[PDB]
Amino acid sequence: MIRPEYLRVLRKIYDRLKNEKVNWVVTGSLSFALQGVPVEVHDIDIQTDEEGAYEIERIFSEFVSKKVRFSSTEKICSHFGELIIDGIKVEIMGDIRKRLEDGTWEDPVDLNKYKRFVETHGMKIPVLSLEYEYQAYLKLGRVEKAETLRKWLNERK
């Protein structure tokens, strides 16, 4: 499913994080593909906690394209940075919070609650619950992506 160039970058990421005390999960398109959803993989998204975002930046320091900084829109905020590894963009998002209807910010997710693991090519990759991402996508208005996930999930069940 996943194109070799993405598998190779995933391995580079895994090899540097697998023995470090960092809470991380792959999210978005690569996570969906790893879990069997036939979506196109464009870029890599890594979700973590606040401390983890700065740790990942340190661990991958030679690949940094944008330093991690607390960054907000009206709709979402996180400790956000970027790597480029072999031409592939890797976004780092620590302690993501979505804006609620009343203008408060939700608490960041407990990543461990929604984490699962996919074995691929000798790697045990942490990924985010598809049900969780489906619901998050609805809240953000990413309706086509949510409905793609939902259709695939419905077709398993």
> What CATH number does residue 151 fall under?
3.30.460.40
Domain containing residue 27: 1-156
Indicate left, alpha or beta for 122 from its phi (over 0: left) and psi (-120 to 50: alpha): left
Distance from the first to the final alpha carbon of the chain: 21
Q: Is the separation of the CB atoms in 80 and 96 below 8 Å?
A: no
Technique behind the model: X-ray
| DSSP secondary structure letter of residue 62 | G
Q: How far is CA 58 from CA 6, 61, 87, in A?
A: 21, 5, 19
Provide the number of structural domains found in the chain. Answer: 1
